[PDB]
Write an enzyme that holds these catalytic residues in place. Sequence first.
Site, PDB file in Angstrom:
ATOM      1  N   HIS A 129      92.473   6.611   3.446  1.00 16.35           N
ATOM      2  CA  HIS A 129      91.235   6.236   2.774  1.00 16.35           C
ATOM      3  C   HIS A 129      91.530   5.172   1.696  1.00 16.35           C
ATOM      4  O   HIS A 129      90.785   4.226   1.575  1.00 16.35           O
ATOM      5  CB  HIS A 129      90.621   7.476   2.058  1.00 16.35           C
ATOM      6  CG  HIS A 129      90.388   8.622   2.952  1.00 16.35           C
ATOM      7  ND1 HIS A 129      89.537   8.550   4.034  1.00 16.35           N
ATOM      8  CD2 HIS A 129      90.869   9.886   2.913  1.00 16.35           C
ATOM      9  CE1 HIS A 129      89.484   9.736   4.609  1.00 16.35           C
ATOM     10  NE2 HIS A 129      90.286  10.563   3.953  1.00 16.35           N
ATOM     11  N   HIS A 187      94.367   4.985  -7.815  1.00 18.94           N
ATOM     12  CA  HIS A 187      94.096   4.344  -6.550  1.00 18.94           C
ATOM     13  C   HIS A 187      93.021   3.291  -6.785  1.00 18.94           C
ATOM     14  O   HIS A 187      92.488   3.183  -7.863  1.00 18.94           O
ATOM     15  CB  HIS A 187      93.616   5.338  -5.507  1.00 18.94           C
ATOM     16  CG  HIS A 187      92.348   6.004  -5.910  1.00 18.94           C
ATOM     17  ND1 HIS A 187      92.338   7.128  -6.686  1.00 18.94           N
ATOM     18  CD2 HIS A 187      91.055   5.645  -5.718  1.00 18.94           C
ATOM     19  CE1 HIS A 187      91.062   7.450  -6.924  1.00 18.94           C
ATOM     20  NE2 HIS A 187      90.269   6.559  -6.347  1.00 18.94           N
ATOM     21  N   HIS A 194      89.612   0.909  -4.854  1.00 15.23           N
ATOM     22  CA  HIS A 194      88.637   0.665  -3.815  1.00 15.23           C
ATOM     23  C   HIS A 194      88.405  -0.818  -3.743  1.00 15.23           C
ATOM     24  O   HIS A 194      88.428  -1.485  -4.782  1.00 15.23           O
ATOM     25  CB  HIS A 194      87.320   1.334  -4.118  1.00 15.23           C
ATOM     26  CG  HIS A 194      87.433   2.798  -4.380  1.00 15.23           C
ATOM     27  ND1 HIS A 194      87.143   3.753  -3.420  1.00 15.23           N
ATOM     28  CD2 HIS A 194      87.829   3.471  -5.482  1.00 15.23           C
ATOM     29  CE1 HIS A 194      87.371   4.965  -3.932  1.00 15.23           C
ATOM     30  NE2 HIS A 194      87.813   4.832  -5.180  1.00 15.23           N
ATOM     31  N   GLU A 233      82.911   0.123  -6.696  1.00 10.18           N
ATOM     32  CA  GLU A 233      81.989   1.243  -6.540  1.00 10.18           C
ATOM     33  C   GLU A 233      80.894   1.192  -7.559  1.00 10.18           C
ATOM     34  O   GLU A 233      79.737   1.083  -7.220  1.00 10.18           O
ATOM     35  CB  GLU A 233      82.786   2.553  -6.609  1.00 10.18           C
ATOM     36  CG  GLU A 233      83.791   2.611  -5.479  1.00 10.18           C
ATOM     37  CD  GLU A 233      84.154   3.986  -5.030  1.00 10.18           C
ATOM     38  OE1 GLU A 233      84.620   4.770  -5.860  1.00 10.18           O
ATOM     39  OE2 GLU A 233      83.928   4.254  -3.830  1.00 10.18           O
ATOM     40  N   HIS A 241      90.885   3.243 -10.174  1.00  9.39           N
ATOM     41  CA  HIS A 241      90.553   4.570 -10.705  1.00  9.39           C
ATOM     42  C   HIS A 241      91.829   5.301 -11.121  1.00  9.39           C
ATOM     43  O   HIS A 241      92.633   5.616 -10.267  1.00  9.39           O
ATOM     44  CB  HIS A 241      89.820   5.423  -9.666  1.00  9.39           C
ATOM     45  CG  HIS A 241      88.466   4.923  -9.373  1.00  9.39           C
ATOM     46  ND1 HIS A 241      87.773   5.235  -8.218  1.00  9.39           N
ATOM     47  CD2 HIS A 241      87.675   4.103 -10.105  1.00  9.39           C
ATOM     48  CE1 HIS A 241      86.578   4.650  -8.297  1.00  9.39           C
ATOM     49  NE2 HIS A 241      86.489   3.981  -9.444  1.00  9.39           N
ATOM     50  N   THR A 262      83.822  10.101  -5.932  1.00 12.01           N
ATOM     51  CA  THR A 262      83.117   9.133  -5.058  1.00 12.01           C
ATOM     52  C   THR A 262      83.504   9.215  -3.593  1.00 12.01           C
ATOM     53  O   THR A 262      83.007   8.474  -2.776  1.00 12.01           O
ATOM     54  CB  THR A 262      83.314   7.695  -5.510  1.00 12.01           C
ATOM     55  OG1 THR A 262      84.696   7.344  -5.269  1.00 12.01           O
ATOM     56  CG2 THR A 262      82.956   7.464  -6.981  1.00 12.01           C
ATOM     57  N   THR A 263      84.351  10.182  -3.270  1.00 10.48           N
ATOM     58  CA  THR A 263      84.639  10.538  -1.848  1.00 10.48           C
ATOM     59  C   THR A 263      84.337  11.992  -1.679  1.00 10.48           C
ATOM     60  O   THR A 263      84.399  12.769  -2.641  1.00 10.48           O
ATOM     61  CB  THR A 263      86.094  10.271  -1.407  1.00 10.48           C
ATOM     62  OG1 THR A 263      86.957  11.216  -2.037  1.00 10.48           O
ATOM     63  CG2 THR A 263      86.500   8.905  -1.751  1.00 10.48           C
TER      64      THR A 263
HETATM   65  C1  LIG Z   1      89.429  17.322  -4.204  1.00 12.54           C
HETATM   66  C2  LIG Z   1      89.303  16.063  -4.654  1.00 12.54           C
HETATM   67  C3  LIG Z   1      89.704  14.865  -3.798  1.00 12.54           C
HETATM   68 SE1  LIG Z   1      91.062  13.753  -4.635  1.00 12.54          SE
HETATM   69  C4  LIG Z   1      89.931  12.416  -5.424  1.00 12.54           C
HETATM   70  C5  LIG Z   1      90.199  12.007  -6.700  1.00 12.54           C
HETATM   71  C6  LIG Z   1      89.460  11.020  -7.265  1.00 12.54           C
HETATM   72  C7  LIG Z   1      88.416  10.400  -6.572  1.00 12.54           C
HETATM   73  S1  LIG Z   1      87.452   9.117  -7.342  1.00 12.54           S
HETATM   74  N1  LIG Z   1      87.303   7.960  -6.208  1.00 12.54           N
HETATM   75  O1  LIG Z   1      86.183   9.710  -7.646  1.00 12.54           O
HETATM   76  O2  LIG Z   1      88.285   8.683  -8.454  1.00 12.54           O
HETATM   77  C8  LIG Z   1      88.097  10.853  -5.301  1.00 12.54           C
HETATM   78  C9  LIG Z   1      88.870  11.848  -4.736  1.00 12.54           C
HETATM   79 ZN   LIG Z   2      88.250   6.284  -6.536  1.00 14.32          ZN
END
Ligand SMILES: C=CC[Se]c1ccc(S(N)(=O)=O)cc1
Ligand SMILES: [Zn+2]
Length: 259
Positions: free
Chosen positions: A63, A93, A95, A105, A118, A197-198
């Site tokens: 992802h 990470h 996007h 985002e 992020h 956001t995922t």
């Molecule tokens: C159980 C949680 C999945 Se890990 C994770 C961490 C941060 C984001 S974000 N894009 O919102 O920073 C999305 C997913």
């Molecule tokens: Zn993110």
Amino acid sequence: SHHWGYGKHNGPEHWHKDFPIAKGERQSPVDIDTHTAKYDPSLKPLSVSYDQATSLRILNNGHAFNVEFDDSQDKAVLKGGPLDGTYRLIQFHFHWGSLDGQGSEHTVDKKKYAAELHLVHWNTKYGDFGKAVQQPDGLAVLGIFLKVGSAKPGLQKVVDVLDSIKTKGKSADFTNFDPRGLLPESLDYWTYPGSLTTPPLLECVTWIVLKEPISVSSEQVLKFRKLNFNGEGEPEELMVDNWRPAQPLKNRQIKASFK
Ligand SMILES: C=CC[Se]c1ccc(S(N)(=O)=O)cc1
Ligand SMILES: [Zn+2]
Ligand SMILES: C=CC[Se]c1ccc(S(N)(=O)=O)cc1
């Protein structure tokens, strides 16, 4: 099993069928209307304390890619601003888009940036990340916009390892990386209560979005776009446009740290 992604067949418009909170009351990201956001004098000073950050590994998870940190103690933490207590850095990470005019985002007066960083932190009063994501104040995500211009020198160690993690499930050592090199000069920010956001889209995040973008080079972002969503040996699907669009603000107000 999880089969959500970013394509036409499994992308953000489909997520609600397996993750009904997708249509909830505090979803992220959102558009930041700069004229409507209000300076909040109640915000305490923000404290980004990354001196002792200990990076470990970089992972393509199919992802995005995560740069992971040792979060077994308070080595790198975020405090202050809108936050009560101590939030431990676990990973960062990005996007990004297929072209420079999309990828972020969050948006700023509907403007999309080329990418968004992020830095993810969990509230240490909950003990572990998995417990933290079940709480309304469990996470703090520091979001930083990327525009294309001059190169970001502190990003280049990341860019240079990406060819070794092209495909989903590949990881590489990534020790001794200093995430302070990814910040802008100013810590002016906007903040609001939102979500991951995922999937699983949990409504557990205090968002802190910096106003000042960082500049990266076209060559740097082009290297992000050579990653793959697919695993090794599978038909190539370039890892691009791994962003969720802005969601309804609903009963929320975005606060500014600055006047
Ligand atoms: C159980 C949680 C999945 Se890990 C994770 C961490 C941060 C984001 S974000 N894009 O919102 O920073 C999305 C997913
Ligand atoms: Zn993110
Ligand atoms: C080939 C068609 C897609 Se199979 C599929 C699509 C979307 C999801 S979702 N609701 O987790 O985004 C789950 C499973």
